[PDB]
Amino acid sequence: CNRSCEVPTRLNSASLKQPYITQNYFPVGTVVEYECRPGYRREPSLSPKLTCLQNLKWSTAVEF
Amino acid sequence: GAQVSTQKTGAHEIIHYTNINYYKDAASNSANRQDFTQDPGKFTEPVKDIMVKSLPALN
Amino acid sequence: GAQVSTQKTGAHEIIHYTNINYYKDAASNSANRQDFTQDPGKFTEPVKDIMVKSLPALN
Amino acid sequence: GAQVSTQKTGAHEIIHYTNINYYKDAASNSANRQDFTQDPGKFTEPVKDIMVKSLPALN
Amino acid sequence: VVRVADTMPSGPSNSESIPALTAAETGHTSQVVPSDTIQTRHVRNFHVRSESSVENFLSRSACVYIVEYKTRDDTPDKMYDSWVINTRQVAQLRRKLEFFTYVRFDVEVTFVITSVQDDSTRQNTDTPALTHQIMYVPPGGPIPQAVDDYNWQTSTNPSVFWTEGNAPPRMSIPFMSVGNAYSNFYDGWSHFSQTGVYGFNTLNNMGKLYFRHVNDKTISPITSKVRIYFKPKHVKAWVPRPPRLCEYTHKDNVDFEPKGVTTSRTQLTISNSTHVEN
Amino acid sequence: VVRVADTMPSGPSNSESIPALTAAETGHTSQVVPSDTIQTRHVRNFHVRSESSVENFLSRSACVYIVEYKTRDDTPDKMYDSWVINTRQVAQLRRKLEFFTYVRFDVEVTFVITSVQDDSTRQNTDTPALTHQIMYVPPGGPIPQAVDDYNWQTSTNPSVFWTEGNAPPRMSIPFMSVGNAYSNFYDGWSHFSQTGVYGFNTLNNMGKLYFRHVNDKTISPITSKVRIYFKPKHVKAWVPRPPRLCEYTHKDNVDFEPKGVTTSRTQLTISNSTHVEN
Amino acid sequence: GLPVMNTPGSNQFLTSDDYQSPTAMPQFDVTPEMNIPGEVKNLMEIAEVDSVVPVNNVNENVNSLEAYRIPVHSVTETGAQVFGFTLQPGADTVMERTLLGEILNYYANWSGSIKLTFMYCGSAMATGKFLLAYSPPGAGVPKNRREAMLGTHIIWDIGLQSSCVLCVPWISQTHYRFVSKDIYTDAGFITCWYQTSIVVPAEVQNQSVILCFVSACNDFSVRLLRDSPFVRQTAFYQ
Amino acid sequence: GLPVMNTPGSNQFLTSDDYQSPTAMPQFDVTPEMNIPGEVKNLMEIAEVDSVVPVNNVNENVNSLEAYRIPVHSVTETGAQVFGFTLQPGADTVMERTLLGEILNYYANWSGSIKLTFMYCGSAMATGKFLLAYSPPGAGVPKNRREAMLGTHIIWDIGLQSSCVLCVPWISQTHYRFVSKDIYTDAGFITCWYQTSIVVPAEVQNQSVILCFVSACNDFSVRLLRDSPFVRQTAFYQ
Amino acid sequence: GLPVMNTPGSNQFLTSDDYQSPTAMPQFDVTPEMNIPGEVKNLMEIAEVDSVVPVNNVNE
Amino acid sequence: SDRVRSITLGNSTITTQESANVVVGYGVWPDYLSDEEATAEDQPTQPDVATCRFYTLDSVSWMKESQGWWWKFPDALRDMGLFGQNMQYHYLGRSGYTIHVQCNASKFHQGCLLVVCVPEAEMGAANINEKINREHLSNGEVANTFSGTKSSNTNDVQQAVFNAGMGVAVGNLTIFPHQWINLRTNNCATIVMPYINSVPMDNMFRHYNFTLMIIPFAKLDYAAGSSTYIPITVTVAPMCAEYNGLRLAGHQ
Ligand SMILES: CCCCCCCCCCCCC/C=C/[C@H](O)[C@H](N)CO
Ligand SMILES: CCCCCCCCCCCCC/C=C/[C@H](O)[C@H](N)CO
């Protein structure tokens, strides 16, 4: 029963991959990864990853 | 830096008001509801070879 | 002890406003949003032996 | 019956403010926070036969 | 604007002029300018001793006191309050005023009034806005003994009414003293035979404040607390005095526990640090 | 009023005057007027570089922070809050201020205070108007440790009281710095041996704010949040600086993830569109 | 007692105000102002400085110094081309994150001419001529060299002065254009053409590099303060 | 009816105000002002007065008059030392509760030079020389007499004028230092050295005492009103 | 502190007002005014122009 | 011709025959601190020409795949004769600088360098929330080297050329006083920086004043048979230096 984050930030052009979309309990330092939703394509100048910080809030995720 | 104008008043029987502008922009000022000029010579009489109104203006 | 300036207005078609300072400290005053001067000669042209722009400026 | 003074401002780089007294009693007025004079000659150097500071001041 | 004094340039010296050798035995502070012992340069100094003046040191809204009273109590004595006016129950403004031996000033007075709904069974009410009365009684006048006393009718005594939600009450008060200045310290007695009460308590004599709710008795208890904020202004002060070392114990005397001079050290010399390692 | 420069008329040219051929190798931006390469006409231009000045660019009511605290909590630490003052926890005003390396300004400060009734069983109350206290503590002063601490008595520290429903609080603050200007960037250490902390964190030293409800403990929890809005004014700035590319990560350093230069393309040349059809 | 009527807009908080407020630290002694070199009074003093344009941003060279390197070499057929982009200093991907484009993204209107400077960073034995051209909108992008020489072009001869200036004037129907994309304020196209060739002697490297700069003229102006579309924050930085 | 807009900061109570208020006792007759000798207009008139420094505060002499007595005697080897402390008039434990330090603890910035006066309270047959030295920060504390004579020192010969003045000038990079402790505004060190010895005749007491004073010069200034860290109250005094 | 009495009609919104208000876009640079032909200053310049009268409006 | 320039300081002289225009500062020339903006009270040490002279740093080798080098200049001149000695005995100091960067090749060579002086170039760390060692920021007279890819050495600076250590676009560094050494036509890299700080004097060790960076935008490229070893030499002078607050020997 450690500290956990919320559900990661719902983006309107990306969805989670499939180890991360089902499971809860995100500890600190956890990286999650997003994939392009259908039908979208990747922007190569941005890395689609989110780290959860010490204050139990994710990093800024805008539009991948 | 005040300015004193006349108030809109009746006829056949010159009261003044005072005005100060408080803000730095001119879009802030109160509306100019005291300009009564007109010139209906571009819509009426919009012709060339200006008529006389007593002549027949033809032939 | 008032001071009267000009309002920011449009071009191609001098309205004044008045100002009084109420507090004893100068940090209290309203911001100076009407200084439009510039001098971009220390960032552009930041050289020695000032060029002419019509000569080749080399050899 | 207003009075115009200078505002407290920085050095190395005279702004005025205006003041009106509204009440009939002088205990009502705002505090005098702009008197910067001093005279530390009654606490330091509080002696008789005033010294020179270059002489030994004894014998 | 009176700037601080400047530093003048100097050079080498070999003469019978000795500014460093002084006599501190003559009650006299030496006035050695730093250009007299070392060789200095020209410093045009632009600093102002502005915020160290006695007005700029004392004219802040300090305090004096907190006052509690209720609007529905079974005992009729906790329904209103009172306070004999001194400036010596809070240590910060007391120490600041006791930098000097005599003072003379006007007072700007502000009240900060806050009300809390007390605990009861019937705690869900619809209460209208509370209204407060602060009545000042000059020294010798008649005192109220209840909240429905007819001595609150303030025909000559100055009183202030306040409604919940507005700006706080503030009023100015002139130099209300019978001597030429106020006394922070009085070394004497009340009776001519050198008996009676000793110290500054003979000279307080300011009258007292009285506090109540103007409303009638409510159906649920609400406790109100008003904080009297004193703020001096138009200040003059005479014959200065060392800052107090020890802690205050009471409001009517200067009695103290003997405290040492300063914080201790472990040795009389300094050196570099002997902690952990390189 | 300083208008922008105008366009002068020109004609054909065949001479040894070459304004297009320059040397960009000499750190020098060429100043080619458009009347030197093409034949132009007389344009009397009436535009003003007004809203691009540093005052008109920075003097907007930006922010710095959101602050939360309750009026009835079992833990005594969530009943008040505090904030060490920097301008580097929100990226918009941080990036705008970090266009320049040195700045000097006065600050106009506004608070926006909103309270929400928390969830409890006894949620139907009759609550009077909440009153807030915002106390500023200069660098080095004493800090409160509870809501009923006697360090809140603000005798020398400047504090602001506010009642629910009024205009928001706003006060002006002078140039509160020990150097000649503020530092957006500091390339150095705190200790002389080039150890310690690195960067701009050595020079912050602004003191901190403290927030509480002036009322006593209510019978139901209400959480209040106050937003500190910073707004600079009377601005001067020195030695400009490129805009930041990467995203900020922390408030005490300049550490970043390496981001590419711009958005990509698919080829190095342009052409007409190859979508659907005529 | 003075008769006063409160007007609408009382007790609000507007962000762009110019009012007066009381000082919390009264009669405070502000430190003396010092002459620090390099004072900025207007942000348009910054935008008139040259900064290199990441033209070669083709899908991988963004994460390198190759974004700024424009390729040029000897071509087996003239009448050719070098590059081209769309004149949108803050909407187009090429000059988006430039100094002029990042000053220009805090605004919403712009006006005035734009300079372009091309430093040829090749050998001193290499020589050649280019066609630097601007095409005002209304037709499409030119597809030949003979369609691009109908525009506003200059022919650049590489020599002892290794850089040239293409000045893009203000050809518009409105006084202002939008710094974002709308179809009503289209601004034209910038293309560069192999005109002749790159001619090198033996034992000299053929493939060289052009660097492109951009800045603003002395009639450039920006108008509507907005927030930049590039700042993004999710949580507070701590 | 006058059109009025209330601005933010209305109906607040700020502690450092300069407004006007009505009088509760109107037309009150204030008693005549009298010329009492010894008027203070500025607190800096007080700080320029000498007050004795409790230098010998070594762990028990605080609760006695021995805190003010600095020991001096004849030493079997010269090149020695007498004492030393850190120049922090309000952070250092030595001159913390002094007159200058207690005026100085209601503030948060200070500036200007500082005087130090050393009254030799020994016999009239005793004689000797001292090395009174100030060391600006950046290096450590000096550990020799030859490291301390690289600073700002004066050699004090004891004679018919029994006291000397060490003047500590203002050597800083900022105009102000903090009256509390930060590493950015370190101020240096004050040490005193047996230079030669104490030389006495027969039947004269060897062990004598130096008294140290401190005050401020005519360029001393304090800036930020705060509350002093030495006042402490738990309940109301009654 | 100035003694002020609020009069009736305070804090209302009347449609035909002539008051002053603060600008939300301060120091805004308005585009230059152009001479467009055909300016109307008074609506009575329009009413003095002939327009045809639908007299034969008989039911279809 | 204006391609030739002589620069004389102390007992040292630099002659160049392929200068383009000697680049010099923000428009301001270095000068001693006036006594109307001064803070410290004792007499400054304007030492002599014994500090106001040229010092040569180490040479870095420009290869085909080199990325960029940097220095920290109050700290890089810390063992350079009596200048560095004054740094070790005074607390406060102050100087402008004449930086002259030299590099030469033949006419069959190609490649272009950017030489920028950046005030207050606060570098960012390779791993994010972690300290940086002083040896990775400033290594004396020895240059630290940027990379192409992101770096992840522990307690080290994030060294990508396309972010320049600080986190900006590297094509935007032409806002600072700079030049280019195009091997076609240049060697004239002066930047005569004035004293730039927010205080009238400052400590030489605790503060870094600015950062020299030499970044090749058009990389070095030559045909087979030309000289493959091309050094780059950086020479630096203090101007109008003065010192204040003399005490014991400082922090090495
Ligand atoms: C209805 C509102 C009236 C408020 C009355 C409250 C204050 C009236 C009493 C005068 C205050 C005197 C201030 C303190 C006096 C001296 O400083 C002390 N004795 C210290 O020596
Ligand atoms: C009781 C109300 C008092 C409110 C106090 C809040 C603000 C007081 C602190 C001063 C604000 C300084 C503004 C920011 C400073 C510089 O710009 C930053 N260091 C950026 O370099």
Give me the DSSP letters along H67-132: GS-EEE---SSSS---EEEE--TTTSSTTSSSHHHHHHTT-SEEES-EEEEEEEES-SS-B-EEEE
Nearest to F186 by CA among J245, J30, H108, J202: J202
Pairing outcome for strands G189-194 and G83-86: antiparallel
Neighboring chains of D (3 or more beta-carbon pairs < 8 A): C, E, G, H, I
Residues 6+ apart with CB under 8 A from G22: C23, C28, F171, F172, H9, H14, H17
- Give the span between the Cα atoms of F35 and F40, in whole angstroms: 5
Nearest CA to ligand 1 atom 16: E182
Nearest CA in chain A to F248: A60
Pairing outcome for strands H189-194 and H83-86: antiparallel
User: Residue H154: beta bridge partners?
Assistant: H132
Of F126, F156, F216, the CB nearest to E127: F126
Residues 6+ apart with CB under 8 A from D56: E18, E21, H160, H161
Rounded to a whole number of angstroms, the CA Rg of chain G reads 24
Secondary structure of residue C17 in the 3-state scheme: strand
Residues 6+ apart with CB under 8 A from H181: H88, H91
The answer to whether A58 faces chain G, any CB pair under 8 Å, is yes
Which 8-state DSSP code applies to residue F253? S
Q: Ligand 2 pocket: which residues have CB below 6 Å?
A: F 85, 87, 97, 103, 107, 109, 134, 136, 158-160, 171, 173, 176, 182-184, 206, 209; G 24
Q: Answer yes or no: are the C-beta atoms of J191 and J205 closer than 8 Å.
A: no
What's the gap in Å between E178 CA and the centre of ligand 1?
13
The ligand with the least distance to the CA atom of E132 is: 1
Instruction: With an 8 Å CB cutoff and a minimum of 3 pairs, decide whether chains I and A touch.
Output: no
Question: Per the structure, how many domains does chain C have?
Answer: 1
H or E, element range at G146: helix G145-148
Secondary structure of residue F96 in the 3-state scheme: helix
Structure tokens at J101: 């960067």
Q: Answer yes or no: are the C-beta atoms of G217 and F34 closer than 8 Å.
A: yes
Structure tokens at G214: 């951009």
CA distances from F176 to F89, F138, F205, H219 (A): 20, 10, 10, 21
H or E, element range at F210: strand F208-213
**Would you call I20 and H2 a contact, using CB atoms and an 8 Å cutoff?**
no
The ligand with the least distance to the CA atom of F181 is: 2
Instruction: With an 8 Å CB cutoff and a minimum of 3 pairs, decide whether chains A and E touch.
Output: no
Neighboring chains of H (3 or more beta-carbon pairs < 8 A): D, E, F, G, I, J
Domains in chain F (CATH in brackets) are 1-278 (2.60.120.20)
CA distances from J135 to E144, E226, J121 (A): 79, 61, 16
Nearest to F252 by CA among J122, E42, G59, E137: J122
- Give the span between the Cα atoms of H197 and J112, in whole angstroms: 71
For residue F160, the ligand 2 atom closest to its alpha carbon is 1
Pairing outcome for strands G163-168 and G114-121: antiparallel
Nearest to J70 by CA among J27, J99, J96: J99
CA distances from A35 to A20, E141, F266 (A): 11, 84, 21
Secondary structure of residue G45 in the 3-state scheme: helix
CA J237 to chain centre: 10
- Give the span between the Cα atoms of F231 and F108, in whole angstroms: 5
Instruction: Tell me the chain D residues in contact with residue E30 when contact means C-beta distances shorter than 8 Å.
Output: 53
Structure tokens at F257: 């993830």
H or E, element range at F106: strand F100-117
* J26-62 CB burial, b ≥16 within 10 A, e <16: bbbebebbeeeebbbbbebbebeeebbbbbebeebeb
Ligand 1 pocket mutation pick from E176, E178, E203 by most atoms within 8 angstroms of CB: E176
H or E, element range at E55: helix E54-58
Q: Is E276 exposed, middle or buried (0-12, 13-18, 19+ CB in 10 A)?
A: exposed
Apex CA J20: angle with CA J16 and CA J25, to 5°? 95
Cα end-to-end span (Å), chain E = 52
- Give the span between the Cα atoms of C50 and C54, in whole angstroms: 12
**Would you call H1 and G6 a contact, using CB atoms and an 8 Å cutoff?**
no
Nearest to J187 by CA among J120, J250, J112: J112
Q: Answer yes or no: are the C-beta atoms of G199 and G76 closer than 8 Å.
A: no
Residues 6+ apart with CB under 8 A from F147: F76, F79, F80, F212, F213
Nearest to I10 by CA among F170, B8, H12, H6: H6
Q: Of J110, J182, J191, J228, which to mutate for an interface test with G (greatest number of G Cβ within 10 Å)? A: J110
Structure tokens at G77: 């057929």
HSE-up (13 A, CA, CB side) for residue F223: 10
- Give the span between the Cα atoms of E261 and E149, in whole angstroms: 53
Q: Which residue in this structure is represented by tokens 């034949």?
A: F39
Q: Please give the resolution of this entry in Å, rounded to 1 decimal.
A: 3.0
- Closest-CA distance, J148 to chain G, in angstroms, reads 6
CATH of G1-238, one of 2.60.120.20, 3.40.640.10, 1.10.150.120, 3.40.50.970: 2.60.120.20
Q: Answer yes or no: are the C-beta atoms of F272 and G144 closer than 8 Å.
A: no
Structure tokens at J221: 């490229």
Rounded to a whole number of angstroms, the CA Rg of chain E reads 28
Secondary structure of residue E260 in the 3-state scheme: coil
Q: Is the CB of E107 under 6 A from ligand 1?
A: yes
Q: Answer yes or no: are the C-beta atoms of J92 and J40 closer than 8 Å.
A: yes
H or E, element range at E94: helix E91-97
User: Residue J13: beta bridge partners?
Assistant: J8
- Give the span between the Cα atoms of A34 and A26, in whole angstroms: 15
- Give the span between the Cα atoms of F154 and F171, in whole angstroms: 17
Task: Tell me the helices (H) and strands (E) count for chain A, helix number first.
Answer: 0, 3
**Would you call G235 and A59 a contact, using CB atoms and an 8 Å cutoff?**
yes
- Give the span between the Cα atoms of F251 and F78, in whole angstroms: 23
Rounded to a whole number of angstroms, the CA Rg of chain J reads 19
Q: Is the CB of E101 under 6 A from ligand 1?
A: no
Which amino acid is residue H226, in one-letter code?
A: R
Q: Answer yes or no: are the C-beta atoms of E20 and E38 closer than 8 Å.
A: no
Structure tokens at F101: 């390396």
CA distances from A12 to A5, E150, F263 (A): 20, 73, 20
- A14-64 CATH fold: Complement Module; domain 1 (2.10.70)
Long-range residue pairs from G143-149, CB within 8 A, at least 24 positions apart, any chain: G143/F271, G143/F272, G144/G79, G145/G79, G145/G80, G145/G81, G145/G193, G145/G195, G148/G191, G148/G193
CA distances from F16 to C50, G101, G132, G155, H187 (A): 20, 35, 21, 16, 65
Region of residue F168 (phi > 0: left; psi between -120 and 50: alpha; otherwise: beta): beta
Nearest CA to ligand 2 atom 3: F136
- Give the span between the Cα atoms of G138 and G150, in whole angstroms: 13
Q: Answer yes or no: are the C-beta atoms of H17 and F160 closer than 8 Å.
A: no
Structure tokens at E153: 């009718």
Secondary structure of residue D17 in the 3-state scheme: strand
Range of the domain at C50: 1-59
- Give the span between the Cα atoms of H95 and H110, in whole angstroms: 15
- CATH class entry, domain J1-252: mainly beta
- Give the span between the Cα atoms of H220 and H199, in whole angstroms: 38
- Give the span between the Cα atoms of A51 and A53, in whole angstroms: 6
